[PDB]
Amino acid sequence: SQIQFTRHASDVLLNLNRLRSRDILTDVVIVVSREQFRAHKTVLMACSGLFYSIFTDQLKRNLSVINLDPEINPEGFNILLDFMYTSRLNLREGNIMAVMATAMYLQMEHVVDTCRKFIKAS
């Protein structure tokens, strides 16, 4: 019965991305080979089965640094981190395989499914 605000969730996500761009209340750095990316653990948990499983565990919840598998492509990771904070996925012929493999590792099914649709559409 409540009044629905159709733009509200997008407004929240935009403001969370603005906080990330200023490093405000970021609480983790994700290390991907020679690169590092700061983020909010809450957003990572909201968007990734891997990060959900890491930070729900009381053993790991307070970690300030997460080292990803050294095989993960930093560009693929950055594309997916930007997707988490924007709802926009930068998929191209030159990055689809790295993005798809990274989304499998991060446990991000809708992106993996979208990568399969991209391949089927050539």
Ligand X SMILES: Cn1cc(C#CCn2cnc3c(c(-c4cccc(C#N)c4)cn3CC(=O)Nc3ccncc3Cl)c2=O)cn1
Give the interface with ligand X as residue ranges (CB under 6 A): 8, 11, 15, 18-19, 45-49, 52, 104, 107-112
- Return the residue nearest ligand X (CB atom): 49
38-61 burial: b if 16+ Cβ within 10 Å, else e: ebbbebbbebbebbbebbeeeeee
Mask: binding to Cl ion, 61-90, rule CB under 5 A, as x and -?
---------------------x--------
- 35-39 β-sheet, strand order: 35-39, 28-32, 65-67
CB contact at 8 A, 120 and 76 = no
After which residues does the chain become discontinuous at a C–N distance over 2.5 Å? none
24 binds a second copy (CB under 8 A): yes
Q: Which does 94 bind (CB under 5 to 8 A by kind): a second copy, ligand X, Cl ion, none?
A: Cl ion
Residue ranges binding a second copy (CB under 8 A) = 1-6, 8-13, 15-16, 19, 24-25, 27, 40-43, 45-47, 55-56, 61, 83-84, 86-91, 110, 114
